[model samples]
Structures are given as C-alpha cells and as structure tokens.
Target chain A: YQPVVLHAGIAYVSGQLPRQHGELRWTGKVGSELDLEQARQAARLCAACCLLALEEALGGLQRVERLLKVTGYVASAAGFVQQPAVIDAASEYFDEVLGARGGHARAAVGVAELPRGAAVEVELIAAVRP
Target chain B: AYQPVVLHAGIAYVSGQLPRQHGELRWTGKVGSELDLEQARQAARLCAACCLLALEEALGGLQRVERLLKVTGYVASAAGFVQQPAVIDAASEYFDEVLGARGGHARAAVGVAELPRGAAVEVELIAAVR
Candidate 1:
C-alpha cells in the first residue's frame, strides 16, 4: 500500500485504522463486544480503504509487485488476548485480492485500546516495479 | 510525527519509547537469546504500559486526548532476525488494556538489529488532546 515514494521500489504505506468516511469503522474489544468475526470484517474494510487510498495516491493497484508486510492491530480487552486471530482480517483480504503476490509477512496483535475506539486497524507495505 | 501536510496549525504528535512496567523489565545483551519471544513480548508490554504510566505521571490519565496520532514498535532481534511481530504485540496489547475504544493511531511494529539494553522490544506513540 505504498504510494508516496517511487525511487526505493517500496511504498511506505502509513498506518491506518478501520476508518470510513474519515471515521472509525468499528470500535470495541477484539474478543469481547467486537468478536473475532466482526473484527475481521472491520480489518478487511480497512484494507480496502488502504487500497483505495493507495490507488488514489499512486493512480492504481495494477503496478503493485509484491505485498511485503502486513500488520494488523486490535484493541483488545483484558484477559482477551488473541493477536493472530485479530490480524487475520486484513491478511485474508490481501490474500483474496492480491493472490500469491500479496503473500506478505504479517503480524496480528492485540492491544488495550486504539484511536477512535476502532476494533481493528491494518497496514501494509508493497514493492513496485518502478 | 506526520511529516507531510503542514496545511494546518495541528501537529501530529508521536510517542516516545520508555521502559516497560515502570522500567521493571531491563536487560543488557543480544536479542533472541537474552530475551526470547515470550520475554520479548513481556518487555514490549512493559514499555507500552509505562508509556501510559509516564503520561499518567505527567498529566494524569489520557482524558484530554482528542486523538491518537501514531505509534512505533521495535523488536531487538539477534544477528539473523526472526519473530519480530510477536515482540511488538506485547506493546500494542498493553495500549488497548488502558486506552480502550477512543484510543486509535497509526503504528509500526518493526524489528531491528539492536534496541536499548538489548531488550527484545520497544514501543512509542503520539496523540493530541482536548
């Protein structure tokens, strides 16, 4: 989801939450009120937003060479720790949309809270053949 | 801090690294061995926990927080690194434990050759308050 630099062969896509229309897509605990299924959908939406933003910034997603890194953060509740599960939301989205080339090094983590109360957040790095 | 778009009077604040668990977790050596994945995760948790602790020590809770800007994660890995994300999770989760809902931000949980005290991980953040 890199869209700023064209010289390094990498786009340093900044971090983004599950935000829509400039607002959080969801806000709650990963395993509590948010649940894994809901959180995953939110994360995928974030990935979609990221793709759109990247496309807007760089014109389109066709030139993307490889999805290098995929990172997802979940605002978790106490005693409810599931990092891998929360991150799956975004990773799976890339897998469905980008295929093998989108196979990325990923990490799904749980945290106490996130901005605007977003249940999940996602970010990615892509290499381009500039 | 967001280096782009100086279009307004706002400044995107970024958090700084601090010792974990009120500086309870400390070590001096190489990563991977000195602090394995579990230890690294704990170290990251402590760091994130204390960042809030420091703020609490400074301005008293995060009630004034209007918005979170960004967060950064670093894992101190051995010469040939692996398992950096696991290290970062510790911090991300800790943040969630305290902030809840309204606590979202852009973030990076990355690995490096070395970190302070050869700690397995580190975290930092920035936010704006009302």
Candidate 2:
C-alpha cells in the first residue's frame, strides 16, 4: 500500500515514531531499563506504524518496490549499547511483513532523548514497487 | 505537487533557517570547522528552504500551515566550543520571516561529532500542514 509519488521508480517514506496521537506506547531506556525483546517489538511496531502512515500518506504499500532505508533511534542508557541489535527488530519485522519484496539499508543509533521519552523511534525510506 | 496535508493525510513537513543574521544566505560551513556566524547561516538556509519550498507549492502560495511540531539542530564542533542555541537561532529567525506569527515552535540545540562534508552545522525539524 503505497500513497506517495509514483515516479522515478522510488518511494521516499519519511520518518515515523513509535507514538500515536502524541503519546508514547512505551517508554524508558534501551538495554538498561527496557528489555531487548521489548525493544524488538518497538522496532517492528514502528515499521508497521510507518507502513500504515505511508499508506495514508501515499496511496498503497504495493507501490513500494523496495525499502531503502530505515533509520532507528533508541534512547540508550550508559553501558547498555546495542544500537544495531535493537534496530534489527524492526528490520526483521519489515522483512517478514514485506517478504521478498521489501529490502533496505539501515542505521540504528543510540540517543539521549526522544519525543515523549519513548524507547524507540523509526523512520523509513523506500523505493516504490514497480 | 501535493500539499503538506490533504484530508488529514499527507506529509508533515518542517524545516527552519535556525541561525539567521545578514545577507541572502547567512551561514556557511561544512560539518567540522571553526565556528562562525556565516556557517550558522548556511545551515539555517538549508534547513528553512525545505519547508518554504513545500508550503509555497502546497497551497499554491506559502501560507498553508496548521501546526509546527518541533525544531532541533546540531552544530558539529571541536573541543571547547559552545554556541549551540545561537547557531540554531538562524533557522528560527528565518522561520519568523517566512511563517510569521505561525512560527511558534519548540527548539533544541545540540552538538555532534561530524556533519556532512564536515559542515559546521546541520538542522532537523517537524511541522504539520494541511
């Protein structure tokens, strides 16, 4: 379900956070106070949320030929660094959900703060399905 | 081109000039360099040009803003440098010039390791339009 522009064989799905209606679904620091499994869930949830948002924003996700980039940010606590690992949660989700159709490069970083103090926020970039 | 929002569904676009001073483009600097006002202005120009271009295209004019989410900027600097807020101000001033009274928004100034091309500054933001 893609809803954005449908030209140049590309789709640019902008950033998406793990919050809805201005509230974080989950909160706290990753790998310290937050469980790794939960962090995974957050990532996947972010991917799904972005897909839904992109659907609304563009038109249909089917228009997405490829998932280009997924930028993930985790509110990391000191001595609890697993940026890439935490980001993979969303990666696996997108891989499963999109299946043989969605592929992308990614960057997962640890930050000090995020909106609503959420543990995770995910944003996407993609190439529309051809 | 599509407007920022159409039917409560579209892009939530945002950008700002952050640090503003004089001339057409105020600041200029890649990520890593000695801090200067001109460098701040360049980042501000890049930051604000984004929203203005979109809004101007969206409403077929430049006044279709519903809300501004936030404005966060980063100025990459070496040891012992501290001008974060002032640097981001360039974009804020530009926002005032373009968005006028509608430009009220939250802001943050941060320091980073390095920015693209060692640019002295870089900015990011969020705004809603419909």
Candidate 3:
C-alpha cells in the first residue's frame, strides 16, 4: 500500500510504527513489557516515519501546509492509563522539527497490539499548501 | 465524539471515538476473551455512530458530506486474535447501510493492546464536505 495517499488537498500518512535499519525499534505493550519512556521514543520514531512518508509522497514537504490531525496508538498492558503522555513524544517531535506547522489536533489511544508487534503507531492527516 | 473534531480545507477530521453511547462504554476488554466477536462488532458499530455524531455536528448535518474518505479503527484484541478486520467490518457495514456510496471508504483496522476507558473499539475519520 502507499505510505501516504493524497486526495482533495489532504495527505493521509498511513499509520506508522517504530523501525530503524529495517528492524522494529521496540515491541510489546507500554506500562508493562515496555516502559513509558521507551514508548515515547517509539512514538518519536513513528513520528519521524510519518514525516518521511510525507516527504516521499509530496516530493519533500514543500507542498505540505500543516498537519491537521495526528492519532497515536500505544500498546498498553493491563490498566495502563498514561496514554496521553506516551503519545506526547510524537507531538513534541513534530513541534520540534516542523515548528508551528506541526501543531495539530491529536488523539492518543491505547490498544492491545499493533501491526508487526510494534509498541506504538502514529497516523497523520496533513493539509496541502495549495 | 471522543475528542475535538476539526473541519479544515473542506475535510472534517473527526477524532477517535470510543465505543460509548451514553458516556459509558458499550463494551470493554479484549475481544475473544472478555467480549465475543459479535459483542465487539456491536462496539465497532457504536464507535462508528459516535464518528457520525461528531461529523454531523461539524458539518451541521450529514447532508453536506460529499464522501467518506477514510475510517481508521483500532480494536482492543486478545492474544492470538487476528480478526481486527472483522470487528471493524461492522463499522464499515453500518456506514454502507446508512450512507450508500457516500459511505464507501478506504480504511485500516488493527488490533491494539489498550484503549482509553478500556473501550473495545476506537473509530476516527476524515470526510470531505461540500
């Protein structure tokens, strides 16, 4: 599938998982098998992947205006409630690199497992510059 | 609506909505363990309804919506359960019934470790409007 799909002036970055050098950076749920900080790092990697996807889809970020929505998924082990904090890393990653253009409506969710046993997944919807 | 749903550039980005109808979750825990596939399907339906509720509010009605662009669903699944697509198919099925061609959309459904408030399902969407 396409890493990112653009339609009607919006770019949808497919949900991303943390990977480096073609290997998963982390696996297992946060608050148990994985710690919150580790999940944060995973979220950051996923965020970076989303940006990379936007770059690939739009031939760099020249046509990207602003991210409209970001939905972060964190695998949680029993009763893990600090989901918002775990996903914050992705938002922070965006803000740090993209500045004000990265500001977006964000949602953090906890789930049982992600594709490929990923600890975290990040999805984005971005507006086009034109 | 689980959170804020934003309308920008002729698209309404609805935040993830948990399977809650009256401020209380309709279902919780992992499917195939605490809840059966049928129950989880119902939960998916509820989440879809919540997305429509948010979209209705954002567009002042569903009438103005030109197309349903995407639906991203996360199911709180049990170990070894790979039927996330089946659970979310319920969400897609309902939209098909209610909106016809307008409901046809590209979607992604994945099993996850946890969800806010222990929800069985979370549904988020982006829909184009007139």
TM-scores, chain A, per candidate: 0.87, 0.84, 0.95
lDDT values of the candidates? 0.63, 0.61, 0.83
Write the residue-wise lDDT of candidate 2 on A1-130 in tens digits: 1123332453444445565553557777787768888887777777777778667655676766768877787767767778888888888888887897667888777765554456787766667643
**Ranking according to TM-score, highest score first:** 3, 2, 1
Please state the error at residue A104 of candidate 3 in Å.
2.0
Query: Which tens-of-lDDT digit does each residue in B5-105 have in candidate 2?
Result: 33235335443323333323344443334546566656755666655565566556655575454565666644334455566677777777777766655
DockQ of each: 0.06, 0.08, 0.22
Better of 1 and 3 by TM-score: 3
**Candidate 1 stretches greater than 4 Å from native:** A1-7, B1-130
> Best to worst by lDDT, what's the order?
3, 1, 2
Q: After superposition, how far is residue A28 of candidate 2 from its true place, in Å?
A: 1.5
Which stretches in model 3 have alpha-carbon errors above 4 Å? B1-68, B80-125
Could you estimate the TM-score for every candidate? 0.52, 0.55, 0.64
Q: What's the DockQ of model 3?
A: 0.22
lDDT of 1 by residue, B12-127 (tens): 33355535453455644445666666766766777777666655554455675555445677665453344555566667666667777545545565444456655556677655
Model 1 chain B: lowest-lDDT 10 consecutive positions: B3-12
Output the number of the TM-score-best candidate.
3
lDDT of 1 at A12: 51
